[PDB]
């Protein structure tokens, strides 16, 4: 994996891997780092100019939280590449949110602090429709104990 990173351009080569690598936002990284020792993680809404660390800091937080083993089975990632529509937000997002958290192995349960909730990261939520964000409202509120929601955007006004 080291040769693949070395071959990759500097943008991906030096992508932050931990919460200490993002030396940009000491006001938002400490709140996420203190969530580690705690267990209450609120629904996150990262918003800001293009290229400031949002998509990188969310991946770093999910990694530092779950581990590379549980990472694949504990987080769902819906970016602008996927088809995010009212029907999709109603069916698939609710299906994954209304799910039982995966069982953490002894390795993960010993090394990484595994919280009792999954994470649905809707990246670039400023491209969603208004009806999809409307349907997301009670979806992100009822299953709040087994699922949290992290939205990422450049325009906070575009989000309802």
């Amino acid at each position: 994996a080291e040769q693949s990173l070395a071959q990759q351009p500097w943008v991906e080569k030096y992508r932050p891997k931990n919460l200490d690598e993002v030396t940009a936002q000491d006001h938002a990284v400490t709140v996420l780092k203190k969530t580690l020792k705690s267990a209450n993680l609120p629904h996150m809404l990262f918003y800001g100019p293009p290229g400031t660390g949002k998509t990188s800091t969310i991946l770093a937080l999910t990694k530092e939280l779950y581990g590379p083993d549980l990472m694949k089975s504990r987080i769902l990632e819906l970016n602008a590449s996927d088809e995010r529509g009212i029907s999709i937000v109603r069916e698939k997002v609710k299906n994954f949110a209304r799910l039982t958290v995966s069982k953490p192995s002894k390795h993960d349960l010993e090394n990484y602090p595994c919280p009792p909730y999954k994470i649905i990261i809707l990246d670039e939520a400023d491209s969603m429709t208004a009806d999809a964000q409307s349907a997301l409202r009670r979806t992100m509120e009822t299953y709040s104990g087994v699922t949290r929601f992290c939205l990422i955007c450049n325009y906070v006004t575009r989000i309802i």
Partner: protein, 318 residues
């Protein structure tokens, strides 16, 4: 637990005389029920003035005990597509039923403005053929949504807004039948906020009675939240920009009204602003629409409404 019906349904008139609506049309329907030769009728008017109650009492008084089999009521909840109109309504129109001499089977199509045009096209000859045994009564809010041929075969009954006197009379009737302490100022406030809507008036009266017991302008304005389109109309006609801004901030914004709702209400009020001229109305509507376009794109802060009012004043003052 014990549960009582609301005052809206408990005191719905079950007899055509108790209706306090338009006297001419109510007397016409009374004479029709007395004679029995009821024709097809499209009743159209504003929401909450007694059209459905009128047609229901008419059918009941006309059919007596035969209401169970001689009345087919299709509303917006039931299916009313091409298939339904062609099959069920036709099979009911041809249904052989022995009624008293001056009676007829009644088909009550409620919310007729939601039916498809093809359904009305298919219903035209169905109604025209069996007119000697089946009569049709449409009830709608927008008679323009009913096609011209269908509207042609029936009598048009336009219901006007309920005057303050009729709403006041029904209010005194309900109060006397309910033994409620009331002040004249509270009833006047209820009538003022009802916007000529019997259902809304009865609902606000019941809410005030159950909340405070004593119907008075204080409790009415406390629990009623005086109508929205009037405050926006007052705001749009302020003298200085400061007064309009203060009315927008204190009465609309602080009281928790959505910005898009404010823009929509301002547009609807400017649409019917008979005081100002045509060109100034059109320019104010254009600025309100620009503000609405800005609101729908996500940015809906108070600054946008402030700029809208500023542009409106810049237009109306110069």
């Amino acid at each position: 637990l014990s549960l009582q019906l609301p005052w809206v349904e408990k005191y719905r008139p079950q007899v055509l005389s108790d209706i306090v609506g338009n006297k001419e049309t109510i007397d016409r329907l009374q004479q029709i029920a007395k004679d029995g030769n009821m024709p097809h009728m499209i009743i159209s008017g504003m929401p909450g003035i007694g059209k459905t109650t009128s047609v229901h009492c008419l059918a009941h008084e006309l059919l007596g005990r035969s209401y169970a089999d001689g009345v087919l009521e299709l509303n917006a909840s039931d299916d009313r597509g091409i298939d339904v109109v062609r099959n069920q309504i036709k099979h009911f129109a041809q249904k052989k039923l022995h009624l008293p001499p001056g009676k007829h089977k009644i088909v009550i199509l409620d919310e007729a403005d939601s039916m498809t045009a093809g359904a009305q096209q298919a219903l035209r000859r169905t109604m025209e053929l069996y007119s000697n045994s089946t009569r049709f009564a449409f009830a709608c809010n927008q008679s323009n949504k009913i096609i011209e041929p269908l509207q042609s075969r029936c009598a048009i009954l336009r219901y006007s807004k309920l005057s303050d006197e009729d709403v006041l009379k029904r209010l005194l009737q309900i109060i006397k039948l309910e033994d409620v302490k009331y002040t004249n100022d509270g009833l006047e406030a209820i009538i003022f906020t009802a916007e000529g809507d019997m259902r809304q008036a009865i609902n606000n009266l019941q809410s005030t009675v159950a909340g405070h017991g004593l119907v008075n302008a204080d409790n009415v304005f406390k629990i009623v939240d005086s109508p929205h389109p009037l405050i926006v109309k007052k705001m749009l006609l302020a003298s200085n920009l400061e007064d309009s801004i203060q009315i927008l901030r204190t009465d609309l914004w602080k009281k928790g009204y959505s910005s898009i709702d404010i823009v929509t209400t301002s547009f609807r009020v400017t649409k019917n602003l008979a005081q100002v001229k045509e060109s100034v109305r059109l320019e104010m509507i254009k600025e309100i629409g620009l503000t609405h376009m800005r609101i729908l794109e996500g940015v809906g802060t108070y600054l946008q409404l402030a700029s809208m009012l500023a542009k409106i004043h810049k237009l109306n003052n110069k």
